[PDB]
Amino acid sequence: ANIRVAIAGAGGRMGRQLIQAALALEGVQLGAALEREGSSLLGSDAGELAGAGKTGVTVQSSLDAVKDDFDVFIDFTRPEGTLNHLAFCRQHGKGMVIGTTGFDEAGKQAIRDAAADIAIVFAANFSVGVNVMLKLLEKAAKVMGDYTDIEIIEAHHRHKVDAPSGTALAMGEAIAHALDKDLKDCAVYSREGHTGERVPGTIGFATVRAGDIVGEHTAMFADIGERLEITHKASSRMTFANGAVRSALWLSGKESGLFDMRDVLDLNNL
Amino acid sequence: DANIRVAIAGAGGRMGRQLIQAALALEGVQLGAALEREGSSLLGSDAGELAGAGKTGVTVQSSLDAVKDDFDVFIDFTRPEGTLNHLAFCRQHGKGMVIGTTGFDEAGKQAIRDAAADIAIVFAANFSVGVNVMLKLLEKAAKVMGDYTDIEIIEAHHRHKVDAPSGTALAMGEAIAHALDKDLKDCAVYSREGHTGERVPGTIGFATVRAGDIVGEHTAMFADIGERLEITHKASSRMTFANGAVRSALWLSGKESGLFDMRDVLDLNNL
Amino acid sequence: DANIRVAIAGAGGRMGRQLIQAALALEGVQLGAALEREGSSLLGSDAGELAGAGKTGVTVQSSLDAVKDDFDVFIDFTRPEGTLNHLAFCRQHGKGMVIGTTGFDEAGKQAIRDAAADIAIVFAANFSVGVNVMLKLLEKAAKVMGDYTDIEIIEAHHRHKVDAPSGTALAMGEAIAHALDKDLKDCAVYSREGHTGERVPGTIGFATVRAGDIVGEHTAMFADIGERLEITHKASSRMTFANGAVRSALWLSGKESGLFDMRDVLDLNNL
Amino acid sequence: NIRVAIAGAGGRMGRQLIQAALALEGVQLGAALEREGSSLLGSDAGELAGAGKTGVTVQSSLDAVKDDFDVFIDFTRPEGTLNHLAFCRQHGKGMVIGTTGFDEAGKQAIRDAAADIAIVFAANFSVGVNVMLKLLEKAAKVMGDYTDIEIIEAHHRHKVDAPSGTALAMGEAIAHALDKDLKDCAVYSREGHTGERVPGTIGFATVRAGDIVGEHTAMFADIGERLEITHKASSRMTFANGAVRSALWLSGKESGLFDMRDVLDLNNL
């Protein structure tokens, strides 16, 4: 490994995962692991925290302490925290992969500034698969969009509280925009009672909520005689981790900047 | 020697065209009549040529009494309102029905319920084998896993279907609900839009896809943490419901009165 | 209608009956000929009754030269051996060709490859739009996720298909393989039976289901730990390949010589 | 109080089984075992199964801990499992086997051992699958005769036996509901020009890829329609809790070999 990461909030589920990714992903090294001061788990050799442990890395909780230890900060904690780690990384030119999510207009507008000073990367979804699908969608909608019926089906564990999934909507948008139309115009979220006929050109959504489903999404292009279905299935929350690590590694060669998975994955030339 | 005659309501519709050739190609049945609305640009059209199988001699017409002696069993796969009269009339004159129309409001359901008093009806939400079998397997599952799992039903049908969810879906819902001493009206969820809460435990949700030429795909899902069971039926051609409805008509041979369904016909009132 | 006459190999088969009505009903195309096996119980019959309705001016037979002036493009959807014969014919006789037959051994594949020298052939493993698009999307996916994910291909077809896996599956295999600078022959795994080891990395496996009337279902799977992408195509009716092949024959028209596939036809090579 | 021996504690089922037992009131982590010189033969069975610590440690000997458990939970490989039998028999020990891939002979040995000891031998320890297994008999009963039957299963990249033992169990369920024996009509591979699917058959398709815990599909195909029954396992924990409660429930029986069905009480519809 020729580069060091910095899994913030190292002790949580995200962090843990993130640590695993750190190990596995060929080409990255675990330079650091942070955690809330005074948390009992301060001190354990990171690796140990997530399965296999040999790491010469001990979970600290001092930003400035580890200043030396990494090459790029991988932040997936709550906002404020994130905001702060950011000013640091900017002040020190450290580089970050912002998995964190939920900023206000001045948060995103904050991350904007930081950009010139340093190489940030910022995505709403660190899944390679997903980001890819999202692209493939444009392609399909392009060719078959016009004449086929488009439906989007998603399913998530019983606890999710927003319908449909934000990813579904993203899919909706991808398609909608590849067809010069706006999702607000042709979205159909419910089909109940005497509906009538599937209106030409509308996109429909079906939402399943059950069990521990991490996340299953299906894009459907239906014609008479054939249909194409593009589907993504997330088995563990690792998916995103793998995304961020790859993302992180990607940054290995830049000074300033603001990106997302398209850039990383190199998808506009796809 | 011979055999029964069948009235085929709304012979123009996609089910009509299926039903007709169905009756034609099958033993024990003679295409009694064919019917249609008044605006139909096809009254008087020859039955079989309408459905490809050449001229027959039967002609679509908009009148019950006009052909009232041309059949024994009335096969209805139109729309509720329509079916209602077919219902009424068939009573007075007393001819056995076979209804496959869906989307009945609780009241209509009652009328059918009433009419069965003197005439015999085979009212089913689906006329395939698979579905009926499934309908049963569901009771079994719900029995064991019903209590603790999350139950969802997903169905998909071609772009032209106008009632949501499929009458079959609802039949599945009912099968489950009743195997769990509860009534579907209580725990059904048809729409999930905007920030809803957590899945109010106990419910049985529905997801409806409408697209293309999908004949019919239905899935019953019993989800737990760690595992889920999915029972799924897929109809590849409308001919399956046709053969289903005809043989039902057939089953009605010698039946004086009452309400039955596919499970009765195929006889699956518990395996 | 206008112009182009089409020879329809093995007019008896399910693809024949589709192809025929396809050509009939489709503008710019005339049912040139119809063909069949050496002792088919179908010889001497008029194409339009077998598949379709309404007797016409074309009757089937077992000879190339017997109708050698009755068409321009030869549409083949028979079996390799058969198809091979035809190929010589159409070549020595400057006729265009549109092949959708599957299951060619690497040698036959060379002959087609050869013949393309003077005549124009449209050789594809699938004649639907969807599949062709998919085929492309695959390159894209394999590009990004090919390297680290496990790739598996699953296909299912009605009980009568006789070549495994589907020629389409193989085509998908190839699409992927070549997008990853590797050759399918190197990493294909067709069977998984009994004890066997850890899935050898970089291998493209195939699972083949054969059952019922399945027109055609194909799935491309890119599996990683934590997520998997599945691209799937489902053909509900044979008509899609028919319209595909007809359009092809209309396209071939003019090309003095050439070797192409549906991607060239549909013009997708730059998507 | 039912102490449990956990064979092959390193394996993915081991790590699950372990925390499973720890987590459960009533069973106590009896022992932990492993293979001749395991890269980690020894240490705290706790650390093994996720972060933290427990009194226990693991070893390569039956007798070395022979008094440390009551029920032996085996989820290793056939060969291994074989030995643990007679031992788990002679020394009168209740076993619960979830290992798969047994040749007809081994299956007999288990069959034999049940004479004096109690075994719960199942190819799958989840509820779903077991129920399914039943529903299958029902379906095959009605539609078995005329439809085409195919079984498709998919599992993570590491599985080494094809097809899944669960698949075969499904195969069997069906076969026997139709008075026929799977050996007669099983088709495992479809490669090259092969004629029309042979009418009586049950075929299998095997997918091996990624981290797939386990997906199984039973398909009854007719012309015009098809019924698909499908089970999906999202986490190995389900089989774990399954095996533990097996063992647990197995306490007290004099002897006999048993399937997850009996435990679950489903044999009666």
Ligand SMILES: NC(=O)C1=CN([C@@H]2O[C@H](COP(=O)(O)OP(=O)(O)OC[C@H]3O[C@@H](n4cnc5c(N)ncnc54)[C@H](O)[C@@H]3O)[C@@H](O)[C@H]2O)C=CC1
């Ligand atoms: N039980 C089963 O297996 C199936 C039930 N159905 C249900 O049966 C019905 C059939 O729809 P499709 O077959 O697609 O046919 P369709 O959707 O093409 O139209 C139905 C037919 O009934 C006629 N009709 C319509 N309104 C009428 C009225 N007011 N009075 C008398 N006749 C009228 C129409 O003119 C046409 O003949 C629907 O309710 C559908 O949901 C459909 C398929 C299968």
Ligand SMILES: NC(=O)C1=CN([C@@H]2O[C@H](COP(=O)(O)OP(=O)(O)OC[C@H]3O[C@@H](n4cnc5c(N)ncnc54)[C@H](O)[C@@H]3O)[C@@H](O)[C@H]2O)C=CC1
């Ligand atoms: N690329 C595509 O879109 C598609 C390709 N195919 C492939 O094309 C072929 C067509 O399958 P089907 O037509 O459904 O089979 P089929 O059951 O219809 O048999 C083929 C027909 O060709 C005739 N024929 C048979 N053997 C012949 C021979 N040795 N020489 C000359 N003529 C012969 C047969 O009499 C019959 O008419 C298969 O290889 C199939 O997999 C099928 C569908 C689509």
Ligand SMILES: NC(=O)C1=CN([C@@H]2O[C@H](COP(=O)(O)OP(=O)(O)OC[C@H]3O[C@@H](n4cnc5c(N)ncnc54)[C@H](O)[C@@H]3O)[C@@H](O)[C@H]2O)C=CC1
């Ligand atoms: N019936 C059910 O509910 C389930 C059945 N299984 C079956 O159980 C087996 C488990 O394989 P995995 O869980 O992936 O384990 P794995 O692939 O992680 O290997 C199993 C563990 O046991 C050890 N062990 C291996 N050979 C041994 C031997 N000869 N004697 C004693 N110990 C040995 C291995 O070192 C390793 O620690 C397979 O045959 C699998 O198909 C797995 C999960 C659930």
Ligand SMILES: O=C(O)c1cccc(C(=O)O)n1
């Ligand atoms: O239960 C239903 O509503 C149903 C079942 C089969 C077909 C159709 C249909 O084509 O509308 N509708």
Ligand SMILES: O=C(O)c1cccc(C(=O)O)n1
């Ligand atoms: O790739 C193939 O082999 C193929 C593709 C479409 C249909 C069929 C077929 O029905 O045999 N075969």
Ligand SMILES: O=C(O)c1cccc(C(=O)O)n1
């Ligand atoms: O019946 C089986 O073969 C089976 C069941 C569950 C898991 C596994 C496995 O992970 O190998 N194998």
Ligand SMILES: [K+]
């Ligand atoms: K024409």
Ligand SMILES: [K+]
């Ligand atoms: K315990």
